[PDB]
Design a protein around this ligand. Sequence first.
Ligand SMILES: CC(C)CN(C[C@@H](O)[C@H](Cc1ccccc1)NC(=O)O[C@H]1CO[C@H]2OCC[C@H]21)S(=O)(=O)c1ccc(N)cc1
Ligand SMILES: CC(C)CN(C[C@@H](O)[C@H](Cc1ccccc1)NC(=O)O[C@H]1CO[C@H]2OCC[C@H]21)S(=O)(=O)c1ccc(N)cc1
Ligand SMILES: [Cl-]
Ligand SMILES: [Cl-]
Ligand SMILES: [Cl-]
Lengths: 99, 99
Amino acid sequence: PQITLWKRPLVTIKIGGQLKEALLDTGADDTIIEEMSLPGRWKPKMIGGIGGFIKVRQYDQIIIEIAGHKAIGTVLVGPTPVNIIGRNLLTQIGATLNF
Amino acid sequence: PQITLWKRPLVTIKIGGQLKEALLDTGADDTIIEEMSLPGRWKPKMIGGIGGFIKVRQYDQIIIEIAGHKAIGTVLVGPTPVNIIGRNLLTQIGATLNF
Ligand SMILES: CC(C)CN(C[C@@H](O)[C@H](Cc1ccccc1)NC(=O)O[C@H]1CO[C@H]2OCC[C@H]21)S(=O)(=O)c1ccc(N)cc1
Ligand SMILES: CC(C)CN(C[C@@H](O)[C@H](Cc1ccccc1)NC(=O)O[C@H]1CO[C@H]2OCC[C@H]21)S(=O)(=O)c1ccc(N)cc1
Ligand SMILES: [Cl-]
Ligand SMILES: [Cl-]
Ligand SMILES: [Cl-]
């Protein structure tokens, strides 16, 4: 698609048997969601945002469908106020920002 | 241009006759610039993301040039670690996400 930005660019994502939605976020280096069903052990990671820094749960090799496109990569679980697809996965689906 | 997302999508901006650089951020609802002087009256606001909220000054109807393209709209000023062009100004230059 060619997505305008008058509203948040939310898309359907799928992980395992869970359908969720997430914000395509060109300003995010990494993907973060609030919850993933029964995802096993993580590795701790720190990341920054505008308000300070948060502890997150790093999961590697996650198979995730994003707007109908398959990606496989790292998904963080943490206290993000909105689920975000960051550049680590945007590049896998071939997303570009155009003007 | 067509901007791939293997690195942060930073572009040149001009605001207040000053050349700066900012992140094109589809995850940001509104634009936030590091501390600088802007004309007109401002209003106090707060904005939120990862790690919580920050206090900002809201300036309305500010001219800006984003990668050579003029936009006019609301600019927040405050303690962001990176200058961010959010959707309120990305829409003014016709930016889209394409995949
Ligand atoms: C978290 C989003 C819903 C909102 N944010 C925009 C977002 O793109 C920020 C924009 C951003 C970018 C750098 C530093 C701070 C904020 N990225 C971000 O927090 O990404 C984090 C996950 O990947 C990591 O890479 C960048 C920081 C980490 S935000 O900066 O908090 C923000 C919120 C509201 C407005 N109006 C403007 C900006
Ligand atoms: C972007 C900032 C300028 C926003 N300001 C937040 C304020 O707390 C700043 C935040 C702040 C902190 C340090 C440096 C700059 C701004 N403090 C400030 O201006 O302190 C002044 C008093 O001491 C002086 O030395 C520091 C600046 C001067 S603020 O305009 O007063 C304001 C207040 C409340 C809200 N919600 C929104 C805005
Ligand atoms: Cl709509
Ligand atoms: Cl979708
Ligand atoms: Cl589990």
